[PDB]
């Protein structure tokens, strides 16, 4: 197992992780090497395929020209996994498009063939023991898993010996249920991975731990004091949203309803859905109509980013914020969602002033809605610092960069390479 911790039966939460010793805020509970992992397509050329090191002058794979490495050792070490995609990418060319889930699942199957025994990533929970929720799958979810299984056979039949379709549905379901997205310091998606021991942890909307990454290594650090006998909880989702939203996401992706202190008390729901203090106050049904509209625009924008232009996307943000502002306060989470999306579009367009303009409005409400140590808060401070620095506002930039560092020292560890990069940014000016 893992020192100072143990696997246990968490009543009404299946298996979980329990503390056997005290952990103070910022203490590393444990580390978990990725069992299987995949660098996202959009990050190729920016990060090493093998170790995820972000570097300039990465060496390109001579065959496919679509994998980049630190050196010949990272290249060689990645080959058992890279071979699943190397020649297929050149053969299928433009037609090579497996989803990230399929790419990761191919790697799980490849690892199971090479290393059938329990790995150092499975000290407490094994990939084979993962919860699948197979019994809870409706026709829509089974159809999505069937598309994934067809893509797996379509792109990965060369090296893989496939189990029956039934074993593949259980696998794809286990991957959806237990998979992690690996994010950088700005919470940008880097790739997807399996961290079996990290997946043993149950969810809470007031977690006592944060998961961070040192390349492909997951690190679990306390963000609240943990005492012997206490269960170790991480958040599976973005905690900005009110109770109903959070639980709709948890029911849809994880097949459970959270009953943590946040979900029970609903303490932050009032401020999260803050209403304007108008002379004629807005009616209850007028609030409910706007909450319904707000959730619909969030989904409309999600779809729109795949095909609409940056100006069309900013229009959706501006127009929706205008409609919402008649009922909702600027600190309201639905207003904040659109502002964050609009900031993201500005960043892409290299409109640094526009991105800064939005970030400035987001930061204070973020601090109030998110937990004490929050990667979402740290990430926003970091973006703001970098924008201020980029725009020659060095004193404001240094203040924001130091606010990012203060949170990151707890979540990532005082010695994290991300903090050394930020300090170099402060020092170089």
């Amino acid at each position: 197992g893992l020192g100072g911790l143990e696997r246990f039966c968490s009543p009404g939460k299946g298996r979980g992780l329990r503390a056997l010793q005290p952990f103070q805020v910022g203490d590393l509970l444990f580390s978990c090497p990725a069992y299987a992992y995949v660098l996202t397509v959009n990050e190729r050329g920016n990060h090493c395929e093998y170790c995820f090191t972000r570097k300039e002058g990465l060496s390109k794979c001579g065959r496919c020209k679509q994998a980049f490495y630190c050196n010949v050792e990272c290249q060689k070490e990645d080959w058992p996994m890279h071979k699943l995609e190397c020649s297929p990418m050149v053969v299928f060319g433009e037609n090579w498009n497996p989803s990230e889930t399929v790419r990761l699942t191919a790697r799980i199957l490849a690892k199971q063939k090479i290393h059938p025994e329990r790995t150092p990533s499975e000290k407490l929970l094994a990939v084979k023991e993962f919860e699948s929720h197979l019994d809870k799958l409706d026709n829509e979810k089974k159809d999505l898993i069937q598309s994934d299984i067809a893509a797996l056979h379509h792109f990965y039949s060369k090296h893989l010996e496939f189990p029956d379709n039934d074993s593949l549905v259980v696998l794809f379901a286990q991957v959806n249920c237990n998979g992690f997205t690996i994010e950088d310091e700005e919470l940008s998606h880097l790739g997807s991975a399996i961290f079996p021991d990290v997946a043993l942890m149950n969810h809470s909307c007031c977690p006592n731990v944060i998961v961070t990454y040192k390349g492909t290594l997951a690190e679990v650090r306390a963000v609240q004091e943990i005492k012997p006998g206490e269960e170790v909880f991480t958040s599976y989702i973005d905690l900005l949203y009110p109770t109903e939203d959070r639980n709709d996401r948890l029911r849809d992706s994880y097949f459970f309803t959270c009953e943590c202190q946040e979900c029970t008390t609903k303490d932050k729901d009032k401020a999260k859905v803050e209403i304007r203090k108008l002379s004629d106050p807005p009616k209850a049904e007028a609030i409910r109509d706007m909450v319904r509209y707000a959730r619909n625009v969030i989904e409309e924008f999600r779809r729109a980013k795949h095909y609409k232009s940056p100006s069309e996307l900013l229009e959706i943000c501006e127009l929706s914020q205008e409609k919402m502002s008649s009922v909702f306060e600027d600190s309201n989470v639905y207003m904040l969602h659109m502002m964050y999306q609009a900031m993201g579009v500005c960043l892409y367009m290299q409109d640094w002033e526009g991105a800064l303009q939005y970030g400035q409005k987001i930061i204070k409400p973020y601090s109030k809605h998110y937990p004490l140590y929050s990667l979402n808060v740290a990430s926003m401070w970091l973006k703001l610092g970098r924008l201020y620095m980029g725009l020659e506002h060095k004193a404001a930039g240094e203040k924001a960069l130091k606010k990012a560092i203060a949170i990151m020292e707890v979540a990532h560890g005082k010695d994290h390479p991300y903090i050394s990069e930020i300090k170099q940014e402060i020092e170089s000016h």
């Binding site: 959806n176 997205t181 919470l187 998606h189 998961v211 973005d238």
Partner: peptide, 6 residues
């Protein structure tokens, strides 16, 4: 997948 932002 299990992350801070979706």
């Amino acid at each position: 997948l299990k992350s801070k932002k979706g």
